[PDB]
Design a protein around this ligand. Structure first.
Ligand SMILES: Nc1ncnc2c1ncn2[C@@H]1O[C@H](COP(=O)(O)OP(=O)(O)OP(=O)(O)O)[C@@H](O)[C@H]1O
Ligand SMILES: Nc1ncnc2c1ncn2[C@@H]1O[C@H](COP(=O)(O)OP(=O)(O)O)[C@@H](O)[C@H]1O
Ligand code: VO4
Ligand SMILES: [Mg+2]
Ligand SMILES: [Mg+2]
Lengths: 566, 565
């Protein structure tokens, strides 16, 4: 927080000077009730009364103008701070390891981001000014002590009671706020999941189940927040008791001093009026304390997220003295266990030549996609190395891996935007000619021409504006534009029809001359004129060779191949 | 308005009585300064001073006690009302037509549901006690008029100025709140979409572009927020000027009256002291006005959705005489302008027979998935009807259609929780034997009986705990467990190996329970001996028939078969 406000130094100084002079003007104008009951009521003074009233009115007007200026500056400062914190949090969230996103739900992250609004409203143009008034009431307290001692000691006892009440109510408020935030995060995650699955929910008539679950979660949220409501009512009642009893006792003691001839009759009124510049800021700060505690809890949750190491993490002094990812894939002694579920990869030893198309075939439960994820550092192997062109993949920087390796995941995702934006995701500077070239290469031009617009149409949410095969064609078109060294075509041929499948398959074997294409697919319509086919029995590679070599031996590949032909 | 007073009336009466007693006790206790400067200072009466001070302290303690009681009751009432509003809104959202979900983004719906918190903040304990004090200050005003009858005019002028200021500042706060809430909804939508697509974003290195887009959205949100904050600052400054000038004028006029002898010097002090029960509640309400405006705009944004017609309402009527959906499926001449874009379907005539198994095939631009969604009335046909067993689909109860038709969507969605729950999305009163039977039928028992905790593993959101093929097998098992009549296998074997594919095909072929099976597949190898094949291209049934008939005809199906082989 300190670093965010470091550049803005003149604003803070102007705020402090404006607040100081505002407090001085308020203290000066608080003497109106003393001047009224000492030299303007006992004697029949009229012109002096009018002059004094006008002077105090113009002093108050100057005071309120200064308050307006200070409030504007405070609002500007707070909004800048909120911008900095929110942008920093989001920029850090977009750089977390992929194992974080597979455990936590989307709703938790969305709720923890949007909880920064509570931080925004707790440092707004009111709470910060109230804190400034609280810290500046020291001058008023000093002057109030100078006026009289016993009533000042009574006010000091009131301040001590305030402090004790605040200290006692420090932990329960935080606990209640954190519980409410956690329950609200659960509710948000459940609602996001339900809205994303609404199609299945309506298809299967699951309205009642989701309604009951959300009702239970809402009940939990309301229970926690009602506990917080009682916890705040207790503090409010205690603070009101202390404030009112202090006021009554200070009035009684002032009257006692008046009777004994310690102060004049009007100085008690001056003390009472000036008490609004010593006790009222503290009472307002105490009344706003729950808001500050909520802001503290939200900031602590944001810091809990920010504590996680970034996606870089174990980069191990990368070896950027390289030009491209051209070479041999050297999966050797590779094991991966998904972090305490069960082993999936059991010592896989495979080799891919320096530029060729290879295909990985296996059962549904085999870790075929796991190899693709491991090959681009989404995860890290439990044992062994990868050795992209004789050098370990760890020594290569993550940016180069993500830039020179093209991936087509099984779950094709298209963001909401123009087809120009979708076909150019990480590029941001590719001209149009390459766009048409890639679209025609992946057979994604014919449909995109027959649209209300051309390369400018809007796509709703996760590409709901198109069909599944259409989304697959767009996604496979996008990956071609990276001009990659390794193209991991991961089941990018599932939803495509026969004519489109044949066209795109004929197009794939024409990609330049220097690219390693790993076709993770089990269509078996393709994978017939390939250099090597890798078959894995859900734990490791068992059969290697080309199509003719695999069909020559009557093994698992023969068993899979015989039923596909008929 | 709301319709909430019907169940909660005793609590309302208790709050009302507590408010009257609190106001009366405060008015009575305000006279302390008058009794101090009129009867206890001119005539030294320390013995009576202590008694009066103790009595007023007791009065204040009682006043705080009833304030605590009223605050408790108001907090409970607000909690109940917020629960009612939240549940009503969610229950209405869950049963909206699919056009609403197709058009509107997820984040917008999430944000305008979360706005229920902003609706809550204005029905809290303090925000309602301030309003009840404002409405109860009539007694204080009456006593003010009785006491002085001349200084009350200045208070009336102050309240008139407050009303003028609020009437001026009503609309711009409303507009700024609308703008900031809409911008925040857009930012939330972008955030949700980016977090969901983080996989592709990381794969393609598009972190910088998404960061810049989110930065721009945050910046426009903050621009609206700063405009609203400047408006709030202006309103607060004018209110403070009015309050302070009014107080100074009260003091000046009281001093003038005291000099003229029309009223005592302690009566002025009492007037200024008890003005806090007629002018301070008004100022507190005027300061809280932004929260009321935020609640109003949030409630209006909820109402925007709430006025939409639910899916069950669009239906004209229903017929009780239908109990089973088994029979023929007759797609009469039907055309479907899919949301004004293009005619994906036009002049379609299908005559699917009684309970059998048929396939619909074509290029990946046809209306196969659209036809399947029309069969479940996910969309309303523009012109035509889908006759089922001599009954039009429009005149059938929606829940019967949903329950008797199983759909294996291409976007296989697996909800977080127990796998048993993931196989029991629909009916709940299902024994565990049926679940394992369905899993065995869909070739899912073998891989599911290797998990660390059998049918109890907690799968993550969207079924990321398993593979896409395993998710499809789970969906097939769940659809089979539903025990349907018009089971639609929409490419249920997209990425299943030929082993599991053959097993599922054998299970489907051997089902034989008078179930009309529609298999929308791109793999012809699973259709070679599958009754009648409907070839659909450009929204037309160019030709149909059996596999041998289509081979003999030598149409597009023959070309696709030759290319695949
Ligand atoms: N997020 C995950 N956490 C734990 N285990 C997982 C996860 N995703 C997949 N698995 C399991 O680990 C293996 C991953 O291989 P997977 O089945 O995804 O590859 P695949 O052959 O590409 O899949 P498919 O062809 O069936 O879509 C499978 O056995 C799967 O059940
Ligand atoms: N949400 C949508 N908005 C507009 N058009 C759509 C939408 N979904 C699909 N379409 C169009 O409908 C056509 C058919 O898609 P669909 O019926 O979903 O799958 P299939 O092509 O397998 O039948 C596609 O060419 C697509 O352009
Ligand atoms: O749009 V398709 O469901 O024919 O791949
Ligand atoms: Mg896979
Ligand atoms: Mg489709």
């Amino acid at each position: 927080f300190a670093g965010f406000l470091k550049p803005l130094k003149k604003t803070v100084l102007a705020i402090f000077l404006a607040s100081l002079l505002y407090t001085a003007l308020g203290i000066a104008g608080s003497f109106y009730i003393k001047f009224l009951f000492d030299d303007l009521i006992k004697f029949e003074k009229l012109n002096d009364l009018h002059i004094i009233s006008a002077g105090f009115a113009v002093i108050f007007l100057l005071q309120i103008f200064l308050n307006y200026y200070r409030s504007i500056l405070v609002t500007k400062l707070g909004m800048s701070i909120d911008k900095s914190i929110m942008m920093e949090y989001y920029s850090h969230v977009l750089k977390l390891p992929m194992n974080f996103f597979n455990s936590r739900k989307v709703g938790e992250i969305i709720s923890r981001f949007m909880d920064a609004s509570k931080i925004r409203q707790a440092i707004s143009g009111a709470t910060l000014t109230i804190m400034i008034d609280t810290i500046m009431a020291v001058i008023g307290g000093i002057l109030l002590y100078i006026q009289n001692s016993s009533l000042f000691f009574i006010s000091f006892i009131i301040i001590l009671l305030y402090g004790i009440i605040v200290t006692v109510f420090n932990k329960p408020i935080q606990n209640a706020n954190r519980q409410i935030m956690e329950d609200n995060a659960k509710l948000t995650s459940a609602l996001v999941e339900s809205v994303k699955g609404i199609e299945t929910i309506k298809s299967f008539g699951a309205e009642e189940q989701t309604e009951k679950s959300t009702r239970d979660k809402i009940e939990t949220v309301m229970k926690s927040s009602f506990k917080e409501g009682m916890l705040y009512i207790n503090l409010s009642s205690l603070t009101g008791i202390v404030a009112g009893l202090g006021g009554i006792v200070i009035l009684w003691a002032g009257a006692y001093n008046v009777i004994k001839g310690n102060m004049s009759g009007g100085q008690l009124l001056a003390f009472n009026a000036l008490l609004a510049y010593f006790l009222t800021p503290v009472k307002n700060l105490i009344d706003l304390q729950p808001l500050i505690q909520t802001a503290v809890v939200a900031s602590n949750r944001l810091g809990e997220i920010l504590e996680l190491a970034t996606e870089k993490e174990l980069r191990e002094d990368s070896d950027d003295f390289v030009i491209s990812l051209k070479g041999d894939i050297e999966f050797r002694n590779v094991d991966f266990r998904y972090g305490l579920r069960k082993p999936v990869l059991k010592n896989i030893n495979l080799t891919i030549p320096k530029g060729k198309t290879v295909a990985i075939v296996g059962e549904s439960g085999s870790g075929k996609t796991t190899l693709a994820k491991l090959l681009m550092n989404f995860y890290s192997p439990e044992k062994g190395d990868i050795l992209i062109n004789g050098h370990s993949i760890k020594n290569i920087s993550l940016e180069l891996i993500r830039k020179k390796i093209a991936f087509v995941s099984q779950d094709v995702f298209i963001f909401s935007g123009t087809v120009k934006e979708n076909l150019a995701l990480g590029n941001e500077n590719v001209d149009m000619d390459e766009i048409i070239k890639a679209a025609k290469m992946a057979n994604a031009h014919d449909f995109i021409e027959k649209l209300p617009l051309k390369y400018d149409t809007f796509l709703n949410e996760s590409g709901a504006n198109l069909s599944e095969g259409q989304k697959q064609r767009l996604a496979i078109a996008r990956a071609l534009l990276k001009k990659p060294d390794i193209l991991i075509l991961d089941e990018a041929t599932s939803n495509l029809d026969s004519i489109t499948e044949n066209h795109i398959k004929d197009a794939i074997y024409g990609l330049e001359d220097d690219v390693t294409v790993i076709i993770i697919a089990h269509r078996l319509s393709t994978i017939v004129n390939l250099d090597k086919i890798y078959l894995l029995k859900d734990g490791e590679i068992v059969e290697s060779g080309s199509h003719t070599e695999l069909i020559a031996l009557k093994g698992a590949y023969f068993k899979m191949w015989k039923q596909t032909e008929n």
